[PDB]
A paper describes a structure:
To elucidate the molecular features encoded by these conserved elements, we solved the crystal structures of Arabidopsis thaliana SOBER1 and Zea mays B6T1C9, each representing a different clade in the phylogenetic tree. Both proteins fold into a canonical α/β hydrolase architecture and superpose with a root-mean-square deviation (RMSD) of atomic positions of 1.54 Å over 210 amino acid residues. We found that a loop constituting the hydrophobic tunnel lid is the major component determining substrate turnover rate and substrate specificity.
To test for the importance of L63 for deacetylation, we constructed a L63A mutant of AtSOBER1 and analyzed its structural and biochemical properties. While wild type AtSOBER1 features a shallow binding groove for the acetate, with a protein surface provided by the side chain of L63, the crystal structure of the L63A mutant showed a massively changed surface, with the hydrophobic tunnel now opened up right behind the active site. In addition, longer substrates were able to enter the tunnel, as demonstrated by higher affinities to pNP butyrate (C4), valerate (C5) and hexanoate (C6). Furthermore, we tested the L63A mutant in tobacco leaves and found the protein to be compromised in AvrBsT-elicited HR repression. The structural information we obtained allowed us to create a mutant (AtSOBER1 L63A), with impaired ability to deacetylate, but is still a functional enzyme with increased activity on longer substrates. In agreement, this mutant protein is compromised in suppression of HR in planta. Taken together with the structural and biochemical data we obtained, this highly suggests deacetylation as the underlying reaction for HR suppression by SOBER1.
Numbering used by the authors: 2 to 211
Amino acid sequence: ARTFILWLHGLGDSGPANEPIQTQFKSSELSNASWLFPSAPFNPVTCNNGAVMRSWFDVPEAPFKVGSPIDESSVLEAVKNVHAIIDQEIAEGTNPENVFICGLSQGGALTLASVLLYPKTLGGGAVLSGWVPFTSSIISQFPEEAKKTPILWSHGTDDRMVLFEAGQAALPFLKEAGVTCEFKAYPGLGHSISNKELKYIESWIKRRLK
């Protein structure tokens, strides 16, 4: 049926600059999927000394480690924007289980926050080199259906922008929240997208579609 894939770009990037990602998804099963690459608003970014750029939410510190500070309210503002996109596409007849949210880096952190806060079960969330953008205080607000959405987390072991330990820290967080997560480590990969990483995400989406 109709598949919808929302891709969330990283810090300072844009939607149109990442639309060629869909050319790497060459399978026949995803060929009819509808992709959307939105662009974040221009916001000041604290880890860049308040410089304005396309940013989903404020990043207080980078490189991101376990225990690096976060701006939780700023993330929830971005979640509202993502949820309006999902709300609209569901209100146009897409089955929520056919909706997939994927994101790189800051867009990965937004993918995680948007999926765990959406009132309905979605097809899945694919996090590429993301981080947990809020504290455990938010776990109590995760809707019941949202905890059934499968999460695929991909992270590079050599990443020094978002430390690999920060991606590892997402697993105890997600287990405490009652969320299923497949963690896929990529040896020698840094803070970037590899083609084998994307192919594994395509295969993962295909199996979720069953």
